[model samples]
Target: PNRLIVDEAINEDNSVVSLSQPKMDELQLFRGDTVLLKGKKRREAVCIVLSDDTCSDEKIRMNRVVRNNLRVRLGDVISIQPCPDVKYGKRIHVLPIDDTVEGITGNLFEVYLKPYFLEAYRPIRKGDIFLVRGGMRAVEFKVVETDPSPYCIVAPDTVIHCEGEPIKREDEEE
Candidate 1:
């Protein structure tokens, strides 16, 4: 396997990594494929593959979570190996940015949100309002920070919790 330099991708999340088309072809990897990234200390993290022209084959872009998990620094060299498909279970956990929010329904519903960059909905950012709607109820989440960058997908069996508080109201101060 080719030892490639690790770069951070602001557009990527922890659950996924970006690879150039050339690199993907070299590794015989396809979109949605899982790969094990190994760092200097033998630390590794499982990540899904995302193909993007913005990424260079010689450099692999990893999100903060992957970097933290592997304990790799910028410009570090790492090795990548293919892994088996992941079977995510149901019942995802979602955390709201605010400890107290209004009109949060208890019933579970399918959640879908658009990523900061890239077409087609994928889990992935902050300072933005994400709407959660199910059947007859809906709640708005004010995104303050994204742990794995905003590009991390909220796959099944994965818990998605909020990190910050809800947007305050101007009229609250009376």
Candidate 2:
């Protein structure tokens, strides 16, 4: 486990984080393993780990969504460690961000959420947010709740509840 500077990922993917192979081995991590990343203000995220040949040995490469979930900016330091026991999720409650869904229409699940989670098996942390892009626009959904606690894989048969009030950013209030 090590604290490493965050680096921008070459691809805009949210499901995985990248580290140099040496760093991966140093941390006892292997490609496709799940990892818990600790960031500022007690925020953390669980993402699948992967090796990136282009990444530096001392840095971590993660996409904007992971960074957002961790509440860290590029060049910030964060700690990573393997999380091998994260279970398949039973249920998860997600809601679209109020500001982003105003003009949006159609079924949120069929339009975005289902596509994002179906067979993707995304590892999600409660309270973290993910940006789900619809055909015409991006819908940002925050994880309001997760069964079995802070993290879990979105397994098939997991009930995803999207019916509720749109979420407002706690820090964005005037």
Question: Which candidate leads in lDDT?
Answer: 2
lDDT of 2 by residue, 135-168 (tens): 6799888888899788999999889989888988
Give the least accurate 10-residue stretch of model 1, judged by summed lDDT: 112-121
lDDT, candidate 2, at 169: 73
Question: Local distance difference test, per candidate?
Answer: 0.57, 0.87
Candidate 1 global CA lDDT score: 0.57
What are the clashing pairs of model 2?
none
Q: Write the per-residue lDDT of candidate 1 for residues 1-174, one digit (tens) a residue.
A: 457788888687645788889988998998888776777555555667888898888888986556755667889988888766343322222334333345554433233332322232233322333444444444544434344442243454344444333456431111
